Design a protein around this ligand. Sequence first.
Ligand SMILES: NCc1ccc(C(F)(F)F)cc1
Length: 330
Amino acid sequence: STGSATTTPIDSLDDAYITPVQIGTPAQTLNLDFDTGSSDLWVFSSETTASEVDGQTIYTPSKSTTAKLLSGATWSISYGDGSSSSGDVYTDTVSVGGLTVTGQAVESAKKVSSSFTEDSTIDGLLGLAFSTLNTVSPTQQKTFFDNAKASLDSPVFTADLGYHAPGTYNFGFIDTTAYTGSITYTAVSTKQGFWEWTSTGYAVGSGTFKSTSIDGIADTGTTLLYLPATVVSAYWAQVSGAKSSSSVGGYVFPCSATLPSFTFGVGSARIVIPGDYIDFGPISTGSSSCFGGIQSSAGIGINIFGDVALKAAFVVFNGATTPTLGFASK
Ligand SMILES: NCc1ccc(C(F)(F)F)cc1
């Protein structure tokens, strides 16, 4: 079997993408953020403290005839930006784009950090990293992808994110009309639980390609592109007036400048990120300083190929027993 669902940016800066997901019987439709950097499926629910809920659609297990409390199980998660949430655990039926998994662990948020409460448009997260990072205790739980793998025509899903436009997550098949040229596959390390791979280098604008190994993770749940300080400095050096701002927390640039493109290497292939994708707009309303989409990973400890990079490509997450990542131009 297969599944296919449209994913939509939540705002005009592509800060995140939401995808409708059906949970329970009869279906309750929630808009979840598909996150290949985590491995929990957690939702706002009828159990979330009412003051921590501001416009989200909530999952109500009591109205689902297929929901079962997973007696004794809890979860607690903390994200790389300081967000967190925790609660108890149900199993229920979960469908994405026609693809149905029964007995999926649905982690019900009792508490959410303030950054989720202020994001009215995101009802929860659907983790698509490897199940070894799932936070359910005492019995670790499998991700939606892991649960669906048996029944999929092919153990893959693909991410086709749009620039200021809707895109597609496909499960179980590769749409050969969604990309141009060939798909270049590259090896994945699963040792930290992430879709971790090694980029073969980079180029700034029309400069020469610098061959150098950049290890990092493919993360649909992260907005920006976080790269080593040396790479990020060489990019922003080509933008007149760009500077790193401690008060803002990263590189900013005069909104009137035109940004060079950024190329990253996949094996021998090259993926070009248009300069327009790197503009994340004024730091505050009316400001003439704009926030850059390429920032340093020095403070994070891992390089992250977030949405800025992934939306320039058609991306194949191959969950074969030896996993790989595929990139194609589109
Ligand atoms: N999108 C999930 C996520 C968030 C943070 C991190 C970090 F910061 F730990 F690398 C990894 C994955």
